[PDB]
Amino acid sequence: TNPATGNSGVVTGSNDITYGQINDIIGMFAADKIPTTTIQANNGQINNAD
Amino acid sequence: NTDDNDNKNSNDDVDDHINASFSYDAKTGDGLFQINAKSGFKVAIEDKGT
């Protein structure tokens, strides 16, 4: 979520990703959360609801 | 909604973690906030010059 605009679905740059975000990924698959479809950054964005 | 903690995870946020409210009436002309923090949390404030 780009919080300066609250845009749920803004890309996160590779260098800057924190390890805390990964902890969510770790927990997310640890709870078997898998993207039901492949989802991609439309010009760097996916919809907020997405 | 953004990480106050600055994990870049805008899901670990004050608004995620605590509760707040405001109210005002003009026919009284008077206002009030009410605040509490989730699951056994406290809130704190730090002013400079206000």
Of B1, B2, B8, the CB nearest to A21: B8
B28 close to B21: Cβ distance less than 8 angstroms: no
Q: Hey, which residues 8-47 in chain A have their CB within 8 Å of chain B?
A: 12, 16-18, 20-21, 24
On chain B, the residues whose CB falls within 8 A of the CB of A21 are 7-9
| Chain B residue numbers touching A24 (CB-CB < 8 A) | 9, 11
Give me the helices (H) in chain A, please.
19-30
Q: Which of A3, A10, A5 is nearest to A43 (CA)?
A: A10
DSSP-derived pairing of the beta strands B30-37 and B18-25: antiparallel
Looking up tokens 């699951």 gives B39
**Pick from B46, B45, B23: which is nearest to B33 by CA?**
B23
> Please, is A20 exposed, middle or buried when counting C-beta atoms within 10 Å of its C-beta (0-12, 13-18, 19+)?
middle
